[PDB]
Amino acid sequence: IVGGYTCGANTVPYQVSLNSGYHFCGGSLINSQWVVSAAHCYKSGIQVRLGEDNINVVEGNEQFISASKSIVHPSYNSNTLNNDIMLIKLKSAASLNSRVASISLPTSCASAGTQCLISGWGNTKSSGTSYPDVLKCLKAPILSDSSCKSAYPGQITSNMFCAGYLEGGKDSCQGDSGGPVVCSGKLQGIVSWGSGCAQKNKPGVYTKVCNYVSWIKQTIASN
Numbered sequence: 206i207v208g209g210y211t212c213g214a215n216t217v218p219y220q221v222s223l224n225s226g227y228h229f230c231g232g233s234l235i236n237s238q239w240v241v242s243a244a245h246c247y248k249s250g251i252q253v254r255l256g257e258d259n260i261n262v263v264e265g266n267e268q269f270i271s272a273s274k275s276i277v278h279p280s281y282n283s284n285t286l287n288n289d290i291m292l293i294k295l296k297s298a299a300s301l302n303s304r305v306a307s308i309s310l311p312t313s314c315a316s317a318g319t320q321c322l323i324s325g326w327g328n329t330k331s332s333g334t335s336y337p338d339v340l341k342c343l344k345a346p347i348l349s350d351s352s353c354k355s356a357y358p359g360q361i362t363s364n365m366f367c368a369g370y371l372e373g374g375k376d377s378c379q380g381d382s383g384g385p386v387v388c389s390g391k392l393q394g395i396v397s398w399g400s401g402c403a404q405k406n407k408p409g410v411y412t413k414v415c416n417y418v419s420w421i422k423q424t425i426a427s428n
């Protein structure tokens with residue numbers, strides 16, 4: 206997260222870290238057994254880490270649970286990043302408490318102009334590289350679809366939305382991939398892609414979770 210702020214320990218209790226020997230992506234806990242992340246975060250041997258603040262120090266509130274299965278969206282296209290969503294099932298149910306909690310799926314799509322909370326342990330520089338210890342947060346508005354399409358001509362599908370600041374300076378970044386965009390207490394987006402980070406006229410592009418609720422519900426009812 207570039208140009209954001211330190212969230213505060215366990216104030217984003219649905220935020221997870223995906224670990225494969227190292228942190229590589231974020232995710233969102235949607236119930237005791239399932240995490241929503243980006244399909245571009247897919248790999249084998251994922252361990253889900255819940256209740257994290259400092260990802261490099263065991264502070265006492267963590268739950269580390271291996272993934273039992275990963276389910277990439279059936280229409281995910283890794284070239285265009287259309288349908289950039291994946292479900293990850295935990296080998297055992299997480300213990301839900303104040304520091305580990307699920308985030309609601311949306312019943313309707315979010316509105317242009319709505320300020321959302323984006324979070325992660327990704328790069329904090331728009332140029333150069335610095336990775337934070339503790340979880341970072343960013344408040345950013347959903348942009349109009351016309352401004353989104355103008356920023357990325359020929360690249361924005363109906364399964365994507367833009368959020369952030371056209372002036373640049375504030376954005377999600379590498380390492381935040383798969384993490385939450387929460388608007389009005391609902392998981393509305395997943396950190397997907399963008400040209401660089403915090404670049405002028407290049408806002409963040411996010412998977413439009415409201416389009417996937419049926420698929421999510423069907424998949425979790427059957428796996």
Ligand SMILES: N=C(N)c1ccc(/C=N/OCC(=O)O)cc1
Nearest residue numbers: 377379380382397398399402409
């Ligand atoms: N909001 C952005 N500008 C943005 C969002 C997501 C990415 C994803 N990078 O994937 C590689 C990785 O995470 O290691 C890049 C830029």
Ligand SMILES: [Ca+2]
Nearest residue numbers: 259262263264
């Ligand atoms: Ca920790």
